[PDB]
């Protein structure tokens, strides 16, 4: 029903000279784009990844991201110079940006930044800010980032206008792959376990039944991905009943 669009950026700064930035883009649990440090251009991972943008609109946007990648890299390096010797390499920076699409024309946009695997900064409203628990030395980098009115105006435009616009088109163009059903296949095993693989979408029901009565003991594992964009699940502890949207009332009972 509700799809979260996220551009996930991974930037590593080993030392003063070495750095790489790699990004992946998701619409729900489906990868739509990949942008490797090695590549000058953003790659589509779905036939519908350009959404409803024109080739010219896609190109203008890509050009912006290309300038951003080179500029962000130098800005982090200059911020490390500014903070020395307090903060030094190796440095890991993760950026999560995108928007959630709700019923109607409702949307909520986000831009969260993690430093050394800890969420410290977000872009909120018209400027950058630190979040509760962030170290106080980040106030000088935030002051400097907020001095850049040009980047702030661009970010506001991307979050408030571009992200919702793009994702509405993406949801249209990708409707068939997002609303696709894939039947789960289940098998039992136990060593001194209910394996369920190949289902899509992610929402599933897996339970250990003593006839009609359920068992409180049964431990549903984490959702493990398959390389063909389907899911894998385990249920540990007599019959294994699995209920999925693809089965349409015909539940799987494995004794």
């Amino acid at each position, epitope marked *: 029903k509700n799809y979260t669009f996220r551009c996930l950026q991974m930037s590593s700064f080993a030392n003063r000279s070495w750095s790489r930035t790699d990004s992946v883009v998701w619409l729900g649990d489906l990868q739509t784009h990949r942008w490797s440090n090695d590549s000058a251009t953003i790659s589509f991972t779905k036939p519908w990844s350009q959404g409803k943008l024109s080739n010219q609109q896609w190109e203008k946007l890509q050009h912006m991201f290309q*300038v951003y990648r080179v*500029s962000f890299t*130098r*800005d982090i390096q*200059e*911020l490390v*110079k*500014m903070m*020395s010797p307090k903060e030094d390499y190796p440095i890991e920076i993760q950026l999560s940006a995108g928007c959630e699409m709700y019923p109607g024309n409702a949307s909520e946009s986000f831009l969260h930044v993690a430093f050394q695997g800890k969420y410290v900064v977000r872009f909120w409203g018209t400027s950058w800010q630190t979040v509760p628990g962030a170290p106080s030395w980040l106030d000088l980098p935030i*002051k*400097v*980032l907020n*001095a*850049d*009115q*040009g*980047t702030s105006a661009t970010v506001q435009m991307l979050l408030n206008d571009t992200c919702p616009l793009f994702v509405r088109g993406l949801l249209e163009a990708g409707k068939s792959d997002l609303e696709k059903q894939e039947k789960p296949v289940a098998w039992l095993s136990s060593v001194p376990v209910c394996h369920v693989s190949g289902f899509y979408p992610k929402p599933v029901w897996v339970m250990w039944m003593r006839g009609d009565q359920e068992q409180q003991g049964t431990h549903r594992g984490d959702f493990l991905p398959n390389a063909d964009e389907t899911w894998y699940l385990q249920a540990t502890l007599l019959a294994c009943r699995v209920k999925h949207s693809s089965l349409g009332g015909q539940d799987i009972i494995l004794y």
Partner: T-cell receptor
Amino acid sequence: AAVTQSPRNKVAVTGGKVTLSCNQTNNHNNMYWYRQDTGHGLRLIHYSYGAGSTEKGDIPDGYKASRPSQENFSLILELATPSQTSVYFCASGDEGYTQYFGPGTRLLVLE
Amino acid sequence: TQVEQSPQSLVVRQGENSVLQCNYSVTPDNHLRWFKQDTGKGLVSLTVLVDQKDKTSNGRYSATLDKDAKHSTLHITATLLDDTATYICVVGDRGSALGRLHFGAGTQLIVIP
């Protein structure tokens, strides 16, 4: 927002030590050293993001920088060469893109 | 160099207008500043241009900026003897102290009194 430099002109000898000083009372964290030569625009030698910090610019070779305090930023020429005959400019700024330039220092390095 | 100025030098008579050009390849181009430098003296800011298509005015000085064309023009209306100086074009690649200034080599203007 003003920047002062000392001395205004300086005559030094090859292999001698030259210290060009720059002072600002604007409480600016960032300070920059440039040299101006005919046929060229100003070129960044060294800069500083605060007291204790020095960063290499585009053309650092032959120069050493010292930021002993927020106010003072020095350009040290340990072994003056005649190629270092130039006009040296100092600038300062806060978190903004504006750099406030100093009046200059004409250095002449003789044999 | 990433910043080129034209003409290299020019001679005008008092009361005449001077038109000075700047072209750059600096990426990104946050802002463009024009400086006036008198012989022996330092740099005095004449104007800053910040928008995609910008126009500024400061008395007898006026300027334009077209970030798409990566070009700027400085106009001196009714030049005076005191306008004898070097006019320097500078492109800043960030809207904060994180930026580097890219300097043009200047245009020498001589005004005949």
